[PDB]
Amino acid sequence: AYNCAISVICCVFNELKFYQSTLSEEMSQFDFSTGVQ
């Protein structure tokens, strides 16, 4: 509850008084043929 109160204090009460490639293509094709990423 106090963490949620801190969160809601983060915006309201901003003041005081807080209320206390070809090679890449080839590699991909080889990986696809191998079926291993």
Binding site: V12, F13, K17, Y19
Partner: protein, 80 residues
């Protein structure tokens, strides 16, 4: 004379600090006749002028309402 002059000062400040609906406004609008000192002139007239208009207005101060645990609620109602 001067005794009732300081009495007038005391009663005027007492009604001022008092808050009423039919407050000294009725008294003042009828208190157009000698609500202030008159024993030595000069100071008498200027004091009468000062006391006639009761002197300003400006609101300030946080958490000053009834039941302060609602004053934060009053502060709570300031975001929408």
């Amino acid at each position: 004379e001067q005794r009732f002059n300081n009495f007038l000062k005391a009663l005027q400040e007492k009604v001022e600090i008092k808050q009423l609906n039919h407050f000294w406004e009725i008294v003042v609008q009828d208190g157009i006749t000698l609500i202030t000192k008159e024993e030595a002139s000069g100071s008498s007239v200027t004091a009468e002028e000062a006391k006639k208009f009761l002197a300003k207005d400006k609101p300030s101060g946080d958490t000053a309402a009834v039941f302060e645990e609602g004053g934060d609620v009053d502060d709570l109602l300031d975001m929408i």
